[PDB]
Structure 1
Amino acid sequence: GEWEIIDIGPFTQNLGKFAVDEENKIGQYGRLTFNKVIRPCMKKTIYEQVVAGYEYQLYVYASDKLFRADISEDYKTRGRKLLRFNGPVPPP
């Protein structure tokens, strides 16, 4: 994922109070009393990659002339859109 440093404000402090509370439930370290959280605190963002859509670069012949088309497609709705249409273009 992506990593970033956050500071030691009340949100970060309560993250430390969470960890000490859960550890005291397990009971392997003995009764711990939360003191403070110090720098550096690291926050990692976990992502899932998913397809938003597609794009296409076409060479299409129409009425015996050759054009360049640029189409986009949405993954979920399957709806298309024509972005560009230039011609006549020389063959590739």
Structure 2
Amino acid sequence: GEWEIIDIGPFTQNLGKFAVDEENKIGQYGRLTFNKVIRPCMKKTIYENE
């Protein structure tokens, strides 16, 4: 429904370190190390009764 470009701060780089960590474990790309995040970062808001 709604989307937004959120700031590239600490809560956004946690989302990045987490990503990489979970994929270090799937390693389709091996054993990568997290660098940082660039923009834009986006965020979707999901909703649904039925």
TM-score (norm 2): 0.84
Between 1 and 2, higher relative CO (CA 8 Å, sep ≥ 6) is seen in 2
CA RMSD in angstroms comes to 0.6
More helix as a share of residues? 2
Q: Number of matched residues?
A: 45
Identity rate, percent: 100
TM-score (norm 1): 0.47
Structure 2: runs of 5 or more not aligned = 46-50
Q: Bigger radius of gyration, 1 or 2?
A: 1
Following TM superposition, the consecutive aligned residue runs of length 4 or more in structure 1 with deviations greater than 3 angstroms are none
Structure 1: runs of 5 or more not aligned = 46-92
More strand as a share of residues? 1
